Write a new protein. Structure first.
Lengths: 599, 600
């Protein structure tokens, strides 16, 4: 049964990253008192454990049901959503201006961490909505905010992002949905959008589609794309679901997992829409909706490692099979618990290193998001903004990739039993698999990080982070407790920058290099980020243990996980380095027609 | 694009790389495996796989199996397909002539199995499990027992199961508690519940022959007390046909992640009549003819998953237009470039390709050993082939399943979002693949078998058979210009493999936890090392065919390019596995069990 990691969320927020100081230093956070944060975490935890976690298996077994009239969600989904609404969770991290509580985004993200762990398919309904707000908030006219945002902040209305068509997913410049301008200055949108998460459902009073379309004589490619508000129901005089717009769901997908989230073919038959933001600047505006959900999807990766660990640790202490290699440890039982086996511990510690490591990186990133939304200092916003732009793609691709690995360790620990539906471990793997495909594929994210962010800033995007690491190795070089962490961390911090330079050099001779190195580089970057977060959690752990503490075992575990990370996981860097220095030719020399001559 | 048998690559591996013509002529009873007959059987094999079973793979996954009190319904088309397969004589192919068989080599029967598992693994488990229980009756059954059970299994009229697992025990068979009470007439009565029995009950055959692990009434504790019993669903009648219903029933089937089409049964034996096969209390010894077949059989499942991901991905990579090459549009007449222009898509393609073609080479290398163990009359050769199988069998099962799962996941990644959708079949490949690392011995258990039972128990001798072959290859080709670039790293790695074995040994002397701590890393390293040899050898062969002039230049140029990719982008994974296995057991054993979950 899902148990929220509140003690670990507090370790990371309060002790490692000084979230009380951060909230004190920052406009809006006077109502975000330590005691109020703790009560909101504990309220969040209870909803996640008692209301949505028990629906997770229901959602997988039932999925959603299509008919011409609309889409039924699994038993208990909408009734949990009504309770989510009535608790005012939707309004937590939105402007007091448009009906919100004004608490920071980073406190919103802690609630999303627990929602995603408990029931990801259910959490996507509120999750997508949270983004369309961030879109309306950043680019909507005051009247658009008054009509649409107020309703999303209350949760009475839900939001989607409608980009994808059959022929285009990464290549949005090829999109072909049309916005035809009308005398009254509104548009009629004609097109078929596919894979639309939460496109049709029975959870809310209305749905607000944020749709990418093209104006009749716009330029080709991205520079021809505009953003439209297309609600399922056009508002009435009081602002409530009014006239039924010509938006309908023609079908939902049969998928490997995330069955409880309706994945919809949305047909727009000259549906009334309103332009939001400048004509042909839709891609620019949509990237508010996208970088929310990039960090929101990095959260999915964290959730799959956490669920995989919760299951693994429980089964490894309860399942008896075979005996310890150093003699029977439970001779009064017919077998030893499987935790006594070194490989089961390797699998448990892998999931633990990834869950706790990525939790640190995620709430480090979330502090940057708060700064960009609320700081007055433009030096401090701009340094936060460049840090988000470096960490966003790393977090999304790296946390999902190792989250899916972590989910598979969970299954492996159960042996055969892991393949069987009733234990929920195999559902975790199935739900994890989409996280590396949507919200920018691993490959597209890697290309974004290395080409657009790092190589296009001639390495400056990396320097923000390698600065913090270099300052840690200097302040802690002669700290005896983390000597063993600082040495290889300093070495890796150097190599990180060296590799960045060698790849820029290779790329100057052959552009194919940016692609050839990209995923290897992003994965290396991910292990290097977590090397720093584990060296720092180890530093904090050693500080607390030397000062005496009610929780000896808590901090000794942090040191033991850090050492596992450095000695057993971080050396995967060696293969990422070798592959990325090998050059583009070993990928590009084979002719397309020569890949499958063995038939 | 539907399933296409990789016959051209299967021929390259057996005929060109592994000398299968000369091997078959050097073996007693292999005179009927003429090159033209093998090629005829391979063609008929592919026809059956591509036309009868491959179309049923989606149906198997959508319907799965339907339980009722009376029986277990199989997916639409499966039993009719099993009839055409019986009518084709396929079950009889690699079995002895006197018991209904055609007497062809096991390594020919394995080529058919390669194509069956790629076409529809769930369906292939039905005959594939039969193939096991036949091998056990051959090895350990009385001539009477072979007359009744082995003849029906060789015809395919009856199917066979392996019944080991119970709720409390899968790896630890010593704890099993299924009982066998002696009866006055020399038969036994088996009472107990077995779980996760593949093909335990279905509607495809006239009878099912269970090979059951059970305990005699005063047997010693542990594996020393396990005996092996034939328990048929229908007791034979006087003619030798399905007679009296035995007290064997299926209480349920599991709901699973995958292989929905293969019924996974809770089998209740209610004092069912069984017959002791093999000595009393030597069950586990006898049941290991069945288990090693099924381990090289499960390695083949790993190959199958890599193959299916490759066939889907290459077709989609050439048809899907998304974005443009980094070096300017390669298809400017089209609205976007094929995704194969992107280096990362080529990286996923070539990963699946290195693993499929490398593992195929490893598999038929192993299958030549099976053939020598079964047929050779030279003892020195039987001993060396037996010893080579002992080393390769767990490497093949664990490595090929693990890199098979990776390869299936690359397949989905190439389709992007579309790969998560049921219609394309790529996500089923991943879900079917996941069981392959759990059953027939877990990755962790095969890794302990390799390092603990075979390698360290022989003080490194089990490794020598293979390192010898690799060292002779590096000497034979030190001066060979076309492959010098493979030979150098191969010889460095072959030496390191021997050094690592000794160091792990030294570490285990001080701390026995080191055997489990190094096990999976050591098996994965060993896997990568085996494929480094096979890619080097396939690169040598391709150089030799190109220097001599061939009408298939591209085919041989593609082997060199894949071998170079394997060496430069995949083999370096050994770096991670070396560092992990030399890190020590303390980084895994120091954390007390009660301190693993203190964040709640
Ligand atoms: C929570 C559950 C998840 C469910 C959601 C499912 C997924 C979805 O909703 S659809 C996912 C959306 N798609 C993706 O994320 C990946 C596919 N699209 C891409 O990212 C493509 O690479 C794509 C379309 C951006 C390429 O466009 P292209 O015009 O070549 O980009 P580029 O020239 O680099 O940038 C164009 C403009 O976009 C914006 N932009 C691009 N990248 C970024 C970025 N990383 N951050 C911010 N803005 C960006 C900028 O305004 C930029 O302007 P400029 O060029 O002057 O800097
Ligand atoms: C094609 C269709 C595929 C479908 C797959 C579905 C089928 C299944 O999943 S059923 C198979 C699942 N069962 C297993 O694999 C059980 C797991 N196995 C194990 O853990 C061990 O091998 C086990 C329990 C059998 C032996 O345990 P233990 O007694 O501690 O081993 P050990 O003492 O070293 O050896 C016991 C005896 O078994 C035999 N044995 C052990 N290992 C091997 C081996 N690798 N090869 C051959 N014989 C072996 C020997 O006879 C040995 O006796 P001795 O040591 O005197 O030679
Ligand atoms: C779909 C399916 C089909 C099956 N078909 C059959 C069949 O036809 N016939 C049959 O007899 N069985 C069958 N099985 C059972 C299957 O072989 C077992 O699941 C397998 O042997 C593992 O046993 P277990 O699941 O009980 O895991 P356990 O043995 O409990 O192992 C659990 C975990 O502990 C680890 N572990 C255990 N001991 C050690 C050790 N000493 N060192 C290190 N790690 C260790 C394992 O590696 C694993 O990670 C089937 C299973 C499934 C799921
Ligand atoms: C369950 C689900 C829910 C979804 N929900 C939504 C939603 O709510 N809203 C929405 O708008 N979309 C949604 N999508 C669509 C999703 O965002 C796309 O699937 C995703 O962007 C990938 O696009 P694609 O599937 O068309 O693959 P493609 O873009 O065709 O990519 C295919 C392959 O090519 C690779 N590739 C493509 N271009 C390059 C390049 N330049 N360099 C390197 N590799 C490249 C990719 O990495 C991938 O491996 C959803 C999809 C799914 C499966």
């Amino acid at each position: 049964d899902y148990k929220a990691p509140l003690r670990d969320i507090r370790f990371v927020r309060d002790e490692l990253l000084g979230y009380e100081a951060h909230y004190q230093s920052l406009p809006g956070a006077e109502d975000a008192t330590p005691d109020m944060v703790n009560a909101i975490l504990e309220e969040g935890a209870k909803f996640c454990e008692q209301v949505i976690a028990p629906l997770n298996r229901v959602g997988d077994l039932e999925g959603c049901t299509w008919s011409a009239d609309g889409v039924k969600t699994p038993t208990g989904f909408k009734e949990a959503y009504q309770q989510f609404v009535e608790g005012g969770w939707p309004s937590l991290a939105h402007d007091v201006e448009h009906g919100g509580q004004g608490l920071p985004e980073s406190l919103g993200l802690a609630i999303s961490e627990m929602v995603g762990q408990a029931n990801w398919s259910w959490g996507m309904y509120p999750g997508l909505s949270h983004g369309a707000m961030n879109t309306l908030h950043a680019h909507g006219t005051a009247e658009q905010q008054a009509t649409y945002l107020t309703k999303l902040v209350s949760g009475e209305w839900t939001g989607t992002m409608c980009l994808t068509e059959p022929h285009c997913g990464t290549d949005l410049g090829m999109l072909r949905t049309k916005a035809e301008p009308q005398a009254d200055g509104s548009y009629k949108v004609t097109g078929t959008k596919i894979f639309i998460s939460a496109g049709e459902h029975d959870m809310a009073d209305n749905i607000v589609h944020i749709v990418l379309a093209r104006l009749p004589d716009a330029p080709q490619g991205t520079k021809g794309i505009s953003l439209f508000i297309v609600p399922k129901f056009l508002p009435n005089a009081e602002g409530n679901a009014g006239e039924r717009n010509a938006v309908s769901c023609g079908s939902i997908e049969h998928k490997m997992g995330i069955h409880g989230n309706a994945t919809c073919v949305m047909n727009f038959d000259a549906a009334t829409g309103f332009l939001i933001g400048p004509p042909n600047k839709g891609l620019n505006c949509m990237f508010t909706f996208m970088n929310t959900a990039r960090l929101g999807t990095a959260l999915q990766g964290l959730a799959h490692a956490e669920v995989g660990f919760q299951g693994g640790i429980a089964y490894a202490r309860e399942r008896l099979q075979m005996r310890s290699l150093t003699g029977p440890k439970a001779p009064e039982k017919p077998a030893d618990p499987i935790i006594v086996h070194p490989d089961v511990r390797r699998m448990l510690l892998t999931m633990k290193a990834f869950a706790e490591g990525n939790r640190a990186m995620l709430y480090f990133a979330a502090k940057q998001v708060d700064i960009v939304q609320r700081s007055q200092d433009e030096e401090q916003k701009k340094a936060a903004d460049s840090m988000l732009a470096f960490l966003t793609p790393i977090a999304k691709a790296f946390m999902t990739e190792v989250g899916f690995e972590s989910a598979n360790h969970g299954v492996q620990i159960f042996g055969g039993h892991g393949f069987i539906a009733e234990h929920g471990m195999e559902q975790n793997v199935r739900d994890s698999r989409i996280s590396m495909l949507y919200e920018g594929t691993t490959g597209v994210q890697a290309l974004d990080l290395l080409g657009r962010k790092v190589l296009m800033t001639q390495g400056e995007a990396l320097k923000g982070f390698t600065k913090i690491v270099h300052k840690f190795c200097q302040a802690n070089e002669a700290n005896e407790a983390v000597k063993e962490f600082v040495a290889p961390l300093a070495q890796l911090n150097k190599e990180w920058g060296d590799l960045t330079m060698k790849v820029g050099m290779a790329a100057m001779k052959d552009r194919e290099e940016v692609g050839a190195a990209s995923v290897d580089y992003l994965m290396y970057s991910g292990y290097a980020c977590l090397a720093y977060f584990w060296a720092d959690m180890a530093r904090l752990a050693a500080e607390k243990l030397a000062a005496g503490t009610g929780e000896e075992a808590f901090y000794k575990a942090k040191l033991q996980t850090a050492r596992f990370y450095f000695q057993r996981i971080l050396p995967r860097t060696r293969a990422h380095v070798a592959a990325m220095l090998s050059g583009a030719n070993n990928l590009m020399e084979m002719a397309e027609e020569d890949f499958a001559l063995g038939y």
